[PDB]
Amino acid sequence: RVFKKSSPNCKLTVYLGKRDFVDHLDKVDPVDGVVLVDPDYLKDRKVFVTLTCAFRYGREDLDVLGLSFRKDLFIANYQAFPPTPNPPRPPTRLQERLLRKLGQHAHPFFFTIPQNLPCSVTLQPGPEDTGKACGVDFEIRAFCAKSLEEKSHKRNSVRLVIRKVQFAPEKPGPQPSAETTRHFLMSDRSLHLEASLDKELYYHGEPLNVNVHVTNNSTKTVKKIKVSVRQYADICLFSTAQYKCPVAQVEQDDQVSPSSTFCKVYTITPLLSNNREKRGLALDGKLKHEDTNLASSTIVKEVLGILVSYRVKVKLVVSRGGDVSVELPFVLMHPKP
Amino acid sequence: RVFKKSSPNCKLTVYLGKRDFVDHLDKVDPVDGVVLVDPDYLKDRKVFVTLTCAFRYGREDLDVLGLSFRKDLFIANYQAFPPTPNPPRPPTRLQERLLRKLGQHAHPFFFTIPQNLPCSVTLQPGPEDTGKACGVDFEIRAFCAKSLEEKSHKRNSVRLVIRKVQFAPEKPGPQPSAETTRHFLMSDRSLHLEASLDKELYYHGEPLNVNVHVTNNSTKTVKKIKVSVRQYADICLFSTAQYKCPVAQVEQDDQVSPSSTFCKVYTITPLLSNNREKRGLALDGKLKHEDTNLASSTIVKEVLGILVSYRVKVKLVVSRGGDVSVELPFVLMHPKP
Amino acid sequence: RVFKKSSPNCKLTVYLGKRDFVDHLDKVDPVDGVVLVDPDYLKDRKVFVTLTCAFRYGREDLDVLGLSFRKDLFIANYQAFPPTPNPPRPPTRLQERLLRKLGQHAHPFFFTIPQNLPCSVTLQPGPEDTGKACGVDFEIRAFCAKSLEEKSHKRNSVRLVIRKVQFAPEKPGPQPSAETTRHFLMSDRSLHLEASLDKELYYHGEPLNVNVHVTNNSTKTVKKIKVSVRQYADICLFSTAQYKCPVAQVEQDDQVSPSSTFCKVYTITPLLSNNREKRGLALDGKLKHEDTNLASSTIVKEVLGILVSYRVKVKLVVSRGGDVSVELPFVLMHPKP
Ligand SMILES: O=P(O)(O)O[C@H]1[C@H](OP(=O)(O)O)[C@@H](OP(=O)(O)O)[C@H](OP(=O)(O)O)[C@@H](OP(=O)(O)O)[C@H]1OP(=O)(O)O
Ligand SMILES: O=P(O)(O)O[C@H]1[C@H](OP(=O)(O)O)[C@@H](OP(=O)(O)O)[C@H](OP(=O)(O)O)[C@@H](OP(=O)(O)O)[C@H]1OP(=O)(O)O
Ligand SMILES: O=P(O)(O)O[C@H]1[C@H](OP(=O)(O)O)[C@@H](OP(=O)(O)O)[C@H](OP(=O)(O)O)[C@@H](OP(=O)(O)O)[C@H]1OP(=O)(O)O
Ligand SMILES: O=P(O)(O)O[C@H]1[C@H](OP(=O)(O)O)[C@@H](OP(=O)(O)O)[C@H](OP(=O)(O)O)[C@@H](OP(=O)(O)O)[C@H]1OP(=O)(O)O
Ligand SMILES: O=P(O)(O)O[C@H]1[C@H](OP(=O)(O)O)[C@@H](OP(=O)(O)O)[C@H](OP(=O)(O)O)[C@@H](OP(=O)(O)O)[C@H]1OP(=O)(O)O
Ligand SMILES: O=P(O)(O)O[C@H]1[C@H](OP(=O)(O)O)[C@@H](OP(=O)(O)O)[C@H](OP(=O)(O)O)[C@@H](OP(=O)(O)O)[C@H]1OP(=O)(O)O
């Protein structure tokens, strides 16, 4: 339908046409909206609308102490009333539709979301956390004041969360494929591991099929085989820290004897619902009263923000040392609607 | 009876007449006590008594790193032995009673608690926290040394926690009453919410009766009604952060159809016992092996400290947008004994 | 057997003769090992081996913000290939054994662990923590690069955790024995507590026998008796903080009437398995996929590090005030193999 929220006193309502604004890499969907204000209520006050992209990292108690990392990556402030020159660019048919039903006390606003900006990512809070979640969020905020500097008023202000999202590219990428050979010393023996995925791109909730082939031309015994999907979150503040969290694991007592080959497909699905306990897991941005998913793969630089990526790991568990592994990068994304 | 505690080696005991010292706004009950020392034990050492009002904010691991906020808001140091001039002001009948039963090795001490000081508030720790709790505490400390600068000794020192408390004013304040009207666009329609409490002041454990009246002269349908009590903790460090935590909620699928009125009382009771899981909730100061309650409303400025306050929220849940709300400030306090 | 681990790509393996290196107080077992490299893989790159003793304190989110305390207490960097002069000192019979089976692409390395260094201690993480644990750890790291400054590569590098450990001295120390007398005012009454352990040194998992004797020549009634073992962790960063955590408790409603004596042995055993919930408890260093124990007593200065020590507390619970206590230091250590 149309998305709208009011101030607590109801003197102020913001309408938007949607909450998700798609990053097309060359450009982003612009935010076209309308603020409706009560006339006699603001009086000499002005109506401002603000678009903020904010990046916060740190627990709630670090907020009070001024220790958490809080940076606005993007701020645009718009004086919507008293009305201003019309560009940019026209009014969209949604604004026109809304300015008619609401009348002269409705006022359009327009923002472009800069492309060089992270997408909406929520870092999953633990059950104890009570503040707002760490990550990158976007917020449309409308309020009434004499000037931008005047402090905030809760009763007058509407805060509205929106999201910058990306969708799977249309061009299929190259097939993920990796291999690792453990050579053994003087003898010509070796323990060979090959693995691959059918494709580079998977959709949330779609099972990955991991092709595993083991050539054990050695005297060691593979005693377990472990297949996992790991999330990689690059947190870029002053220094970029990379956090890894497994989000799916199949572990079987499959054995590969000496002088033997082994070939199987392992099917595995990364789901947020098996990971609601992992603090700090990257989630696609938290919306109102909706459910989210594991954060989509970022389509790219180490500017401030959060970059998310995924890999399959296949590990051959050998006794003592001797373990063998490959990793398979893939992409995890929603399909374009 | 009389409150007393000894050092671990028992060479030193502090007696006080009570643990709660009442803030009367114009003044505070003074701390009149006695320290009993073993004569031959201190020898050339002096006996000091200290009254400290301390304000700490931050988890335990931040202590070690020097990151937590720790400020003594008030320190008074008293050399009780070798004895000193008698004022102020006399000895109280409690000190006289105690100096008789204990004799020449008992020594009085006297402190005034400055009024411009927060009251005792404990921030509720999570099950994981193991240090002392954040908040504002008062401590009488007695110990033996050559001078005040000499470092602390656990075996010699007695630490005794006391509380600065407030009680409900005698004059009833004005009846809490609020209203919010959602006007609808061009049509003369409206969705009106009125609410009130019988009184401004409630006692811990006393039920609040929330009078709710809804006039739905609109086409929208109230589908749920939500009544809650929220604690508001103003944490004033360098910047004042306000934390909110609900501590009671009634949520019913009560509906208010278009062109209809609705009138009901909702009864709701904020109890700590339904909130033992909420980390950082403001509690009246933690005493020894006793149970506490939700922190009392502060009777007032943004000096360093913790200010606590309470509100009822009444929310009419309407589909899509359209929600309507009022808030009702009230005071929550113990009655004066 | 022999301990070995490879890089993820298997081009690089580090062998060591053991993982625990014993601090003999006058000196430490040296780390004698071998790195095996694939010849054509490194090409123009060099092989380095690093011995690092690291000290980290702080939760995971403080890492990203640069707030945690991270200090390398000791770093030694060794260019093992292209080979270098032979001392020190010879090659051990383990290196010789290994250089034969592996051949010319195996290269010895040798490190002395400085004595003035803490032992391996892990601070017990909570279930929520996901990073590496706080405490003091030692790590052998081998990798391929042109120079030491070149950044790290995960596929090339092997990381291997080792431990600096201590064992119980051979000379028995003096018997722990303490006493505390509560004298009562004017009357010649008194409440006397004596306690002792059979010995100063106990082994992990060995029960302590606490000899308790109470002479109640007073009018007060001991109503409970509490015996506990407490861990004391001195965390020495910029300022040394001492953290205490009980790790065993016997609490009985044993009573000692006025004009009565009382004599009993209380047996108590500190076990990690009854304390897996205590965040920050000092543990002997966490090895790979093994189980650990409560940290051993440190055999000593307040340099940077973690010092661990233990005491029995015996407390006589008297009504109102009047409690009486002693503490008994003891040592808790593994026997030398
Ligand atoms: O606006 P936020 O700071 O995100 O806080 C909101 C807000 O609480 P306030 O009344 O303090 O503004 C909601 O109220 P509305 O503005 O929506 O009326 C409230 O109520 P709802 O549940 O009805 O949305 C909701 O509380 P809850 O925890 O029950 O969701 C709560 O959310 P947070 O405090 O959790 O952000
Ligand atoms: O212990 P593992 O890692 O499984 O490997 C060992 C190792 O052989 P590698 O050189 O391949 O590690 C032993 O070699 P030594 O160091 O003992 O010389 C060898 O002993 P032999 O050389 O006498 O064969 C032993 O065999 P085992 O432990 O069964 O006696 C063999 O394990 P596998 O030969 O079973 O692989
Ligand atoms: O004095 P605090 O620093 O607040 O610590 C006390 C104190 O422990 P110490 O023995 O280290 O001083 C109590 O001992 P007393 O001074 O009262 O003899 C002890 O024992 P009680 O339980 O008998 O009071 C209690 O331990 P517990 O955790 O069992 O209450 C503990 O409290 P905290 O360490 O939790 O503050
Ligand atoms: O979707 P809601 O927020 O419940 O309100 C809508 C909205 O009316 P408002 O202007 O009061 O929001 C629609 O207006 P349009 O934007 O679609 O013009 C209206 O449609 P009509 O104008 O055709 O009546 C629709 O009615 P419905 O969704 O039942 O077709 C009506 O809901 P109510 O009229 O039931 O309040
Ligand atoms: O090397 P670390 O940084 O300590 O991390 C390791 C490592 O994960 P990577 O694949 O990211 O290096 C292990 O892999 P190997 O180097 O041993 O192949 C992995 O797998 P294992 O379980 O097979 O040891 C293990 O994951 P797990 O959590 O399952 O132990 C994990 O440990 P941490 O991330 O917990 O340190
Ligand atoms: O309350 P407790 O700490 O158990 O000790 C009290 C206290 O005696 P102490 O001086 O030893 O503390 C009372 O002394 P007063 O301050 O009341 O003078 C005394 O009262 P009497 O002096 O009248 O004996 C009272 O006795 P009770 O409370 O049973 O009347 C006695 O407790 P015990 O005498 O039982 O130890």
Author numbering:
A (entry chain A), B (entry chain A), C (entry chain A): 8 to 307, 313 to 349
Which of the paper's sentences describe this entry?
Arrestins modulate G protein-coupled receptor (GPCR) signaling in two ways. First, arrestins bind to activated, phosphorylated receptor and sterically block G protein coupling, terminating G protein activation. GPCR-dependent arrestin signaling occurs in the context of a complex between arrestin and phosphorylated, activated GPCR. Structures of all four vertebrate arrestins in the basal state4, 6–8 showed that arrestin is a two-domain protein with limited interaction between domains.
To address these questions, we determined the 2.4 Å resolution crystal structure of arrestin-3 in complex with the non-receptor activator inositol hexakisphosphate (IP6). To test whether IP6 could activate arrestin-3, we determined the structure to 2.4 Å resolution, which shows that the IP6-arrestin-3 complex is a trimer. In the structure, we identified electron density consistent with two bound IP6 molecules per arrestin; each IP6 molecule is located between the protomers of the arrestin trimer. The structure shows that IP6 binds to arrestin-3 at the same location as C-tail in basal arrestin such that IP6 displaces the C-tail. The IP6-bound structure exhibits an inter-domain twist of 17.7° with respect to the basal conformation. Moreover, the IP6 binding sites in the N-domain overlap with the binding sites for phosphorylated receptor. Critically, phosphate binding recruits Lys295 of the lariat loop, which contains two out of five charged residues in the polar core. This interaction likely elicits a conformational change that disrupts the polar core and triggers the phosphate sensor. Similarly, in the IP6-mediated trimer the finger loop is presented as an α-helix. In this conformation, hydrophobic residues would be exposed to solvent if the IP6-activated arrestin-3 were a monomer, but in the context of the trimer, these form Van der Waals (<4 Å) self-contacts around the molecular three-fold axis and are shielded from solvent.
